[PDB]
Write a protein that binds this ligand. Sequence first.
Ligand SMILES: Nc1ncnc2c1ncn2[C@@H]1O[C@H](COP(=O)(O)O)[C@@H](O)[C@H]1O
Ligand SMILES: Nc1ncnc2c1ncn2[C@@H]1O[C@H](COP(=O)(O)O)[C@@H](O)[C@H]1O
Ligand SMILES: Nc1ncnc2c1ncn2[C@@H]1O[C@H](COP(=O)(O)O)[C@@H](O)[C@H]1O
Ligand SMILES: Nc1ncnc2c1ncn2[C@@H]1O[C@H](COP(=O)(O)O)[C@@H](O)[C@H]1O
Lengths: 323, 323
Amino acid sequence: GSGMDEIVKVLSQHDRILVVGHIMPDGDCVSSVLSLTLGLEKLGKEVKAAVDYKIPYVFEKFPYIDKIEENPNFDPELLVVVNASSPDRIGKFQDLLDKVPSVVIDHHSTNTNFGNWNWVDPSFAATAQMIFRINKALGVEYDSNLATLNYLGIATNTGFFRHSNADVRVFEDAYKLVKMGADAHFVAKEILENKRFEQFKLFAEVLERLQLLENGKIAYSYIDYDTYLRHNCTDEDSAGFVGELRSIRGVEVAVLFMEFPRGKIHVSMRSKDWFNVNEVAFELGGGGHPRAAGVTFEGKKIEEVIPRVINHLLKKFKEGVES
Amino acid sequence: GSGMDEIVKVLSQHDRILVVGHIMPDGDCVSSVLSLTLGLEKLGKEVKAAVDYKIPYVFEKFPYIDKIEENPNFDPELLVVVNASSPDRIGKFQDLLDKVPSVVIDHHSTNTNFGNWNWVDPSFAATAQMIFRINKALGVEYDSNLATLNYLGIATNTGFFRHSNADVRVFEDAYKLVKMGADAHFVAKEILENKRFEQFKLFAEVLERLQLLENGKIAYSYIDYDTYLRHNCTDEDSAGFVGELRSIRGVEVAVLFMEFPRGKIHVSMRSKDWFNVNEVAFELGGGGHPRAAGVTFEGKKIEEVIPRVINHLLKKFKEGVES
Ligand SMILES: Nc1ncnc2c1ncn2[C@@H]1O[C@H](COP(=O)(O)O)[C@@H](O)[C@H]1O
Ligand SMILES: Nc1ncnc2c1ncn2[C@@H]1O[C@H](COP(=O)(O)O)[C@@H](O)[C@H]1O
Ligand SMILES: Nc1ncnc2c1ncn2[C@@H]1O[C@H](COP(=O)(O)O)[C@@H](O)[C@H]1O
Ligand SMILES: Nc1ncnc2c1ncn2[C@@H]1O[C@H](COP(=O)(O)O)[C@@H](O)[C@H]1O
């Protein structure tokens, strides 16, 4: 694939750019979209940012969040798709892939290389780290707001420096961004301290349905669509729940089945010390990382998905213990 | 007070040292005690580490944790007390303050300067940052285990880089320690992903008793001693609960009243954006930081402590809104 140098040249050559992130945006999406958009604007370019999805509440106080548009009305000369592993993930903007030359910048090993130019590097924990390097290579000077926005995705994708992907390069980037004015406490407060009361009630439903297997080493639970409705919640509200199940003493693998909307079952998997959940996800048609991976089924009963996923998980887990 | 330079000289002059931390040890205690003990040992000194308390379960897999003794049986020429703000906090080792010259190293502004030499610097988020600087000044070379142990206290005292005390110096220290081999994911896994099932049941009791005041800006709850007993828990198990209450959308001040043992009521206070909980704590006879502070009552009914604390909190909160 192309490297950073080729993507920097392409970005330099084009002056009307649409930067696009993926649906159901998370911290790395907002971070990467806004950090690249602002970097390119500082070079004088005419740039718009777009996500075909409602921006979640926790991002509403971030600087420049209103630059992300659902309906940009912009005819770009270049499409730049960040942190999105496949064209279906960018919603209605995938139609532009047929009309406009495109750049892909992504850390997901699952990326389908759907751009005319692709820089995909899974050694990074966050696409925001790739945007940081692109901006510095282009000559962008950071201010505090841009540093805060670029810090955001590095923090969220590492669980705020807790996960296995928080390596030396993550800590060096975070130090450089805080030195340049990133407001680390602002980011933690807005992302992690805006919990709805209903999210506590929703998690109580998860605890009620929690089941342990394999001498307590596997824990799984589920939320069906009627339960989301009962609590005025969506799958936005159950973010972080599967990590709470991983946090139980003695659990090595945590799995959460989430039905939202009706008939769409998302499977979120996390592992603690050694089990490669990405191998299970891939074999079920999904994908991810060794310690965090997922699968999405459409048109299924939760009663069919759960036993299939658990069966495959148990088979591979029992292999790993003997090895 | 004395600075770092004076304490480094004193540590250099003495070769039989007892390093002591405080009762109910947390991450910064274990981090500071072991990081200084190992640093001094690398200089060839005869050093023992002691805490007059059972070491919590989450520290049991850390390297060298068995170096912390409850019963050291050691006649030191120098006592070094780390991260303990007052002599009552070190249990039975306070008797040595009358017999042995003592050094105090602490970041708590509440420190009573009870050593013969005192280095107290509240600009640090963690005493572990002060130990890092002492060790480097003495000439200690870090290995991976020592870097992990020194990283521990910086992580735990900042809530793993979430709290208002996570400034540039915290991120630079963390980067330096990870560059020198600190296993950041190991630390997060052992400290944060060893939750007992009973802790979830205990927090459900907290949610049951949760009360909001002042248009949702104040949230408080309590755990009485019978409830700890009911769930086979101690105050070790409710660590982090008050931060969960602060995480509720719209809450500015969270307060958790904890009765453990019987008749001993600890009040934990956290604030989000602007309210100075340390001023309330101090006026009630406790102390702490602007965003995290506490008070401890002995010999009271929970029914007397709660309304007094809430009354004082409301009085000052209502002052801050007008200002
Ligand atoms: N070891 C890990 N590597 C990557 N992501 C993880 C890990 N553990 C938990 N996660 C979470 O899984 C999600 C994966 O993000 P991404 O790599 O952008 O798909 C993020 O929300 C992470 O916080
Ligand atoms: N259906 C899927 N196909 C490919 N990758 C996925 C899928 N679901 C989740 N992932 C990835 O797996 C990790 C964990 O996802 P989640 O459990 O949804 O937070 C993230 O890096 C996701 O991008
Ligand atoms: N702004 C803050 N400053 C210091 N400690 C905080 C803050 N917010 C929460 N805390 C917690 O309060 C405790 C205070 O630690 P210490 O400063 O060693 O007494 C630690 O457990 C911190 O994680
Ligand atoms: N009774 C007290 N007197 C002085 N400082 C305290 C007291 N209780 C708690 N603190 C400090 O206030 C902060 C929050 O304490 P806690 O809420 O117990 O985690 C920490 O820095 C404690 O060391």
